Amino acid sequence: MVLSEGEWQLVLHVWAKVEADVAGHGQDIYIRLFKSHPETLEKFDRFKHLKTEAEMKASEDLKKQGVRVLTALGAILKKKGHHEAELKPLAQSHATKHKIPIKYLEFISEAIIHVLHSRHPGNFGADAQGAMNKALELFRKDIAAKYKELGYQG
């Protein structure tokens, strides 16, 4: 699959708004993921004890993690599909160290789309959401191919 340049520009225009406060966006995305799909929280040995949204919001380590995730994803999106180098280390850690199924990558993709739809209606109308879904689907398709190369079913 391949995105057009116009689609990439819709992705990068909303990502520029995320970058006004990457930490706050990361907190919202993790809270949405863990509330919608609680099983995903069990994969985090440092955070699986958190019981409420208040505790998640107050966790400085979770905030730092959210900044790491969104900055890594942002660097992948800015490559506009030419992300082989960035996906190598990420696929290896997520397949072998963290053991994150493709289904859970689908869940965090849904959390990202929900938070952008809520915060950024000015840059996340239907065409922009479609472009972001295509970019995240491309990311998951290429991660899934690397998972298989690495020996992990996904």
Ligand code: HEM
């Ligand atoms: C957009 C998708 C994702 C991106 C870009 C991403 C990125 C990252 C990065 C950059 C790190 C730190 C370096 C590393 O270990 O590779 C990390 C750590 C981690 N990721 Fe992900 N991740 C994603 C999705 C997920 C999902 C869906 C889960 C689990 C449901 C997950 C579980 C973990 C865990 C458990 C760690 C280690 C956390 C810690 O140090 O406490 N990741 N991720």
Ligand SMILES: [O-]
């Ligand atoms: O993560």
